[PDB]
């Protein structure tokens, strides 16, 4: 691992170099964002150069008739007062931050960004082919300014801003296996309808078969007409006021009938993926960098505390097993007799061996 990232401003005064673009967030510590900025004071026109990591919600308005007019609401932003050393803020550079000065001299000034734990992960909401500008959701940006004071303006070429991700990966220890079950009793009798549901494991990786083992023990005089089965992305967005949606991403309404006083065991296999859920605008994809094709946004891993009504986009997943129970009898179609159980699992990427993320 001997390479670094660099993009400079239009006019090349301000160059920015960064270790990685992906800064991973184990629930406790977020890997600091460490890098350097080089100045060419042959063109040091201005008299101050700051740096800021920004956490922001990128949204296009419902009513905004402008193609690509996106706005950003700031959830978290901080500053390192780096060019040039402001009094007193003396800090030890990193393994990375070192080899960069040794390479470039003191023409380049450092910054370090200890991300806090209770922050969103870079998540991006699927667009429709309508929308055209920068992908919407939670994006991050290190920007590199030049402006005499903090209360000064920034010129559109006197600047560079890079996009980083704060991401998560699947935990090593497999959670306990998900089983939920339920039991409904109807008016017409005391013999009950029972539905048990089991996933084969608690953690699944993008593109992997989820296998749902069903067990309907029907002791009723009602019939189970069909059995919808579904994988649903729960979204918990928080920009100005808390929103929420639970859109389905994988489904199989196989028409198996459990007739009355019958058992039933079937093991329906089922795979999420983004090929068939591209119409579903606003669905959460993982963090997009400029405009590439992401995956179905991975599960968001909250702390054991579950601190607050957290900002950004808290994703989860949950398999649903709904039984469609024939109505009729005393109340006819008036009263609904269906029975469903929801199983929650985790869907993220494993830990990469060492290597982080056309023809990919």
């Amino acid at each position, epitope marked *: *691992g*001997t*390479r670094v990232f660099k993009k400079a401003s239009p006019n090349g005064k301000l160059t920015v170099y960064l270790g990685k673009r992906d800064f991973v967030d184990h629930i406790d510590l977020v890997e600091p964002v460490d890098g350097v900025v080089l100045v060419d004071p042959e063109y040091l026109k201005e008299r101050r150069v700051y740096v800021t990591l920004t956490c922001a919600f990128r949204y296009g308005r419902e009513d905004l008739d402008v193609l690509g007019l996106t706005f950003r609401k700031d959830l978290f932003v901080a500053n390192v007062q780096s060019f040039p050393p402001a009094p007193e803020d003396k800090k030890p550079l990193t393994r990375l931050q070192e080899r960069l000065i040794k390479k470039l001299g003191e023409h380049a000034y450092p910054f370090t960004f200890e991300i806090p734990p209770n922050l969103p992960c870079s998540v991006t909401l699927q667009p429709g082919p309508e929308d055209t500008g920068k992908a919407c959701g939670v994006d991050y940006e290190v920007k590199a300014f030049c402006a005499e004071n903090l209360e000064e303006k920034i010129h559109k070429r006197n600047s560079v801003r890079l996009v980083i991700r704060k991401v998560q990966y699947a935990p090593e220890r497999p959670g306990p296996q998900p089983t939920a079950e339920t039991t409904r009793q109807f008016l017409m009798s005391d013999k009950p309808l029972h539905l048990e549901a089991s996933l084969d494991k608690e953690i699944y*990786y*993008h*593109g*992997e*078969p989820i296998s749902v083992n069903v067990h309907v023990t029907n002791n009723t005089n009602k019939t189970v007409k069909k059995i919808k089965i579904s994988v649903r992305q729960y979204a918990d967005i928080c920009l100005f006021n808390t929103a929420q949606y639970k859109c389905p991403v994988a489904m199989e309404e196989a028409d198996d009938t459990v007739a009355p006083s019958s058992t039933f065991c079937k093991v329906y296999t089922l*795979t999420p*993926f*983004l*090929a068939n859920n591209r119409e579903k605008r606003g669905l959460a994809l993982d963090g997009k960098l400029k405009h590439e*094709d992401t*995956n179905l946004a991975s599960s968001t891993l909250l702390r054991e505390g579950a601190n607050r009504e957290i900002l950004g986009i808290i994703v989860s997943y949950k398999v649903k097993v709904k039984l469609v129970v024939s109505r009729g009898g005393l109340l006819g179609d008036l009263a609904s007799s269906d029975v469903a159980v929801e199983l929650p699992f985790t869907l993220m*990427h494993p830990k990469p*061996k*060492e*290597e982080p*993320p*056309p*023809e*990919h």
Partner: antibody
Framework: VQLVESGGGLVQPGGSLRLSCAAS????????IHWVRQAPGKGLEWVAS????????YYADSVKGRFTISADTSKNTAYLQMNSLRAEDTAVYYC?????????????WGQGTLVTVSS | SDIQMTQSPSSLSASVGDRVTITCRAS??????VAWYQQKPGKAPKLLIY???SLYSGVPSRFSGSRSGTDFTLTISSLQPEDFATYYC?????????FGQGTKVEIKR
């Protein structure tokens, strides 16, 4: 833990061959499936790439209008439709696994199949 | 235009035990994202090295490569029998993925 290629043979220089790569032992949505036309010592040349999870197909330019890449993911297999096969496409065609997340070089190649096209 | 992935040695003989070196240069800047494969003829490639540094899992630890910038090297330290095969330099950052000419090694008797 496996990968095969069935089909492939001798065909006139005008018609069609199509190849069935009946994979096994993994998920067709976490891999990307490619075709490599190395042939007999001429070199190594890529043909095809289907990404089922995204549903995209990438094509080496020399096989655009007469080569088709498909995959019927129930059977975990994948296909190469070869209409208008010339004598240059004569080859030993190859099936090649991938990681969808993310692409880090071609994991697992298959036993291969001798395509042959001369008059 | 397509990238080329030309390796510096075309073929070569050398001694069972010593250090072997294949340079491969790309017609343009494929940052990292070079791959290497050995093929004893009659079989199909095993994969050796992805991303130009990382070696495949299941590979002889006597393998690794690197980049001097645009130039991409592959190197084996103390080889053995059944390593008598041709070695293939692959770039996969763009479509189409390019391959390498080939590089034949022979046990030198």
């Amino acid at each position: 833990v496996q990968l095969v290629e069935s089909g492939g043979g001798l065909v006139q220089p005008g018609g069609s061959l199509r190849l069935s790569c009946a994979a096994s032992g993994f998920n067709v949505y976490s891999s990307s499936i490619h075709w490599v036309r190395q042939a007999p010592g001429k070199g190594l040349e890529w043909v095809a790439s289907i990404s089922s999870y995204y549903g995209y197909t990438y094509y080496a330019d020399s096989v655009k209008g007469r080569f088709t890449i498909s995959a019927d993911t129930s059977k975990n297999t994948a296909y190469l439709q070869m209409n208008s096969l010339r004598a240059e496409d004569t080859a030993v065609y190859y099936c090649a696994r991938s990681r969808q997340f993310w692409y880090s070089g071609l994991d697992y190649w298959g036993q291969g199949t001798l395509v042959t096209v001369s008059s | 235009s397509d990238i080329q992935m030309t390796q510096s040695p075309s073929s070569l003989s050398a001694s069972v035990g010593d250090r072997v070196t294949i340079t491969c240069r790309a017609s343009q800047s494929v940052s990292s994202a070079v791959a290497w494969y050995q093929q004893k003829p009659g079989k199909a490639p095993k994969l050796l090295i992805y991303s130009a540094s990382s070696l495949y899992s299941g590979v002889p630890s006597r393998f690794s490569g690197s980049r001097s910038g645009t130039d991409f090297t592959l190197t084996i330290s103390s080889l053995q029998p059944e390593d008598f095969a041709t070695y293939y330099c692959q770039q996969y950052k763009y479509v189409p993925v390019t391959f390498g000419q080939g590089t034949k090694v022979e046990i030198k008797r």
